Design an enzyme around this catalytic site. Sequence first.
Site: not given
Ligand SMILES: CCCCCCCCCCCC[C@H](C)C(=O)SCCNC(=O)CCNC(=O)[C@H](O)C(C)(C)COP(=O)(O)OP(=O)(O)OC[C@H]1O[C@@H](n2cnc3c(N)ncnc32)[C@H](O)[C@@H]1OP(=O)(O)O
Lengths: 354, 354
Positions: B120-121, B150
């Site tokens: 994460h960040d 981020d």
């Molecule tokens: C008002 C509401 C507010 C909302 C706030 C949200 C909550 C706050 C949380 C804080 C968020 C901010 C934090 C601090 C951050 O830093 S975010 C930055 C995180 N890092 C990144 O984005 C870097 C690039 N991404 C990654 O490394 C990874 O995606 C991750 C974040 C570690 C997540 O890992 P993981 O859960 O294992 O996901 P991935 O390895 O990407 O694989 C995703 C799997 O999902 C599947 N998928 C996706 N879309 C679909 C779809 N439409 N239909 C069917 N399947 C889908 C993919 O096929 C994939 O599966 P597979 O290939 O792994 O088998």
Amino acid sequence: AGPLSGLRVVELAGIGPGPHAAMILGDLGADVVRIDRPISRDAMLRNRRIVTADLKSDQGLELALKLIAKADVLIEGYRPGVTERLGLGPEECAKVNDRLIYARMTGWGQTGPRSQQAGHDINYISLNGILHAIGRGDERPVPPLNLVGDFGGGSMFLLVGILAALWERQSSGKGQVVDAAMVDGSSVLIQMMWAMRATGMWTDTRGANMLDGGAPYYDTYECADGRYVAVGAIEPQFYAAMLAGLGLDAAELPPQNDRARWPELRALLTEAFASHDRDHWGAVFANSDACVTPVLAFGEVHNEPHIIERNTFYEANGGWQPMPAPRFSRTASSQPRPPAATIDIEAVLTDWDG
Amino acid sequence: AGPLSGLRVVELAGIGPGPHAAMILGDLGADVVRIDRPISRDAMLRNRRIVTADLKSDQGLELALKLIAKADVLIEGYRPGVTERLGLGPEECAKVNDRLIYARMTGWGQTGPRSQQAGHDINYISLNGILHAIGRGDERPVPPLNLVGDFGGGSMFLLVGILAALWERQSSGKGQVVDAAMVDGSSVLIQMMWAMRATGMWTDTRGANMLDGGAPYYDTYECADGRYVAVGAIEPQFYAAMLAGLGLDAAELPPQNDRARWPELRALLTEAFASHDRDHWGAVFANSDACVTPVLAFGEVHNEPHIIERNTFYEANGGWQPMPAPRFSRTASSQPRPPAATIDIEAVLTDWDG
Ligand SMILES: CCCCCCCCCCCC[C@H](C)C(=O)SCCNC(=O)CCNC(=O)[C@H](O)C(C)(C)COP(=O)(O)OP(=O)(O)OC[C@H]1O[C@@H](n2cnc3c(N)ncnc32)[C@H](O)[C@@H]1OP(=O)(O)O
Ligand SMILES: CCCCCCCCCCCC[C@H](C)C(=O)SCCNC(=O)CCNC(=O)[C@H](O)C(C)(C)COP(=O)(O)OP(=O)(O)OC[C@H]1O[C@@H](n2cnc3c(N)ncnc32)[C@H](O)[C@@H]1OP(=O)(O)O
């Protein structure tokens, strides 16, 4: 060599966000001409041609306007009205070049009660709730360097504005003015917290939230050697991997998201991390998904394998500097050209045809 | 209504930088279509059409590719290889649309030893010297929320990559891949500190520099009410205006830039600021160039005149949200459209001609 090869930018020498915006444009291949007051050791002035002119003189103005008549973008970062008083305001520039994207970089913006007020980063983010949210809860706010006003919410929004205006120009045939105020950019930068506040997912209490240090799974920890690791194990499966590496039994710990017991959770995590050196943990969680990383000082960055392998940095004379970002698959950016000697403004006019 | 009116974006639903990038494109007038797994109260999801497809399915993949065939930009933010396995990788997308800007948003980048690792960040900025530089010196580093990896070094660099590649497409007629890694963007974001380190103008000692809290004239101070002001008076004339407002006699203080006596200077300034409430200082530095501003909590921002008069914020349903940034003089951005109900993907394909 980058995607912006062919783009012509006139930069009126300023400080902070404006020169950073111009750098990135040059980084990505733009032809950037910086006009200063009558060889720099400032790596930020990479990828430029430096020319000089007295813009308060009739000759300097005339030379500046001729340059501008042939440019795509003008960057200026003075108080509003300053370019107007020089005869280089948007309406004067229009008369010689209505294709021009006129990019005005300020803290407070072009109008409003504070628009004529001096300030720096820390001020722009003090007024919009950002600063108040940064730091430990038991102490006064700490500035996140000048990363959030000057750059993340400043130059970066100027850049978006410039490039978006260039897209629009494709079909209107015309430029326009981009008013990039740090007070605005930084607010859109922090839109996630505004969105979270509206849903009971973020409070105004400094240091008591998921992403500000308040969560024992999202903070730094001091190790046996006085150095630090960063822990960002938000997701339960990442958190579980973290506990494993530390040799802690989850059954013996408070639940991850029981905020009532966070101080107890943090004390256990503190004791764990404090039992070995930073590089020990670096090695324990080298390939894991535990979201645990060593906290490297600037002087150590050059030794980290992921940093080396990807050429995130290059050696300029005298120290490492970051390579251009982001990366492009077909029109890749060059290693930046160091600052060079000032050159004759007339020579650039010949090159450009002004 | 904004400059990006006409631009077609496909967003593959994710978290953090990717959705924030898509938001800003939407903000500026882009036609953004978000593909999620089968109406949001996440204000970040403003300015979209939301559609639903199982991308692991035959029919889901087919519909997504039909949409992509008619788009200008694709945003994805999964681990590298994920879209490849789905059959929506860059090589597959090129077969149906070689004008596509394929925008890949990650922390660690597409390749390298850490490229498959969770994080994460706080992890991305821990590896590149940023984190170590944030906070008071007598304590462990504090995270600058997730503003630096981020967003400032993340989505903002994705956006620059997207709009840069679009400029390039004007003349090559074709797209390419943008590899935006938070570890890179954040490094370019903090280039000023890399430039300074090389000339002896910035040190790796946390909390001991001009812009990190170490300088008494560039930090917050706690007032009589327990609230805070920011002081940013770097230039001697602003510093002078600051002391004047405080009624301190310069002749009687340590010089502004005598670092050896900084603690004595700070203590005098601390005593001064603590003698009245924040609103008093609030009032004392009115329209002055003293670079002294009140430190407003999120919940106070909406009362601040400069914030009000410039419409930096709007009331959505339930809470204040930031208006689009930056601002454009001829093609102004609209007030954002709130999140709406998920729509039929075919209705979008009819709209676009897919
Ligand atoms: C008002 C509401 C507010 C909302 C706030 C949200 C909550 C706050 C949380 C804080 C968020 C901010 C934090 C601090 C951050 O830093 S975010 C930055 C995180 N890092 C990144 O984005 C870097 C690039 N991404 C990654 O490394 C990874 O995606 C991750 C974040 C570690 C997540 O890992 P993981 O859960 O294992 O996901 P991935 O390895 O990407 O694989 C995703 C799997 O999902 C599947 N998928 C996706 N879309 C679909 C779809 N439409 N239909 C069917 N399947 C889908 C993919 O096929 C994939 O599966 P597979 O290939 O792994 O088998
Ligand atoms: C290796 C080394 C690395 C380098 C490290 C650098 C040192 C580190 C310091 C960190 C800097 C970053 C700091 C922390 C920040 O937070 S940046 C935020 C500062 N704010 C802004 O940029 C907002 C927009 N600007 C402003 O408000 C103001 O310009 C200011 C920065 C407060 C300074 O005010 P002031 O000095 O009065 O300047 P202005 O009112 O803009 O007027 C400028 C006058 O100069 C003139 N001028 C300009 N160019 C020329 C020229 N070529 N020839 C002749 N004249 C020129 C203009 O005409 C103008 O004069 P006049 O119109 O007042 O008569």
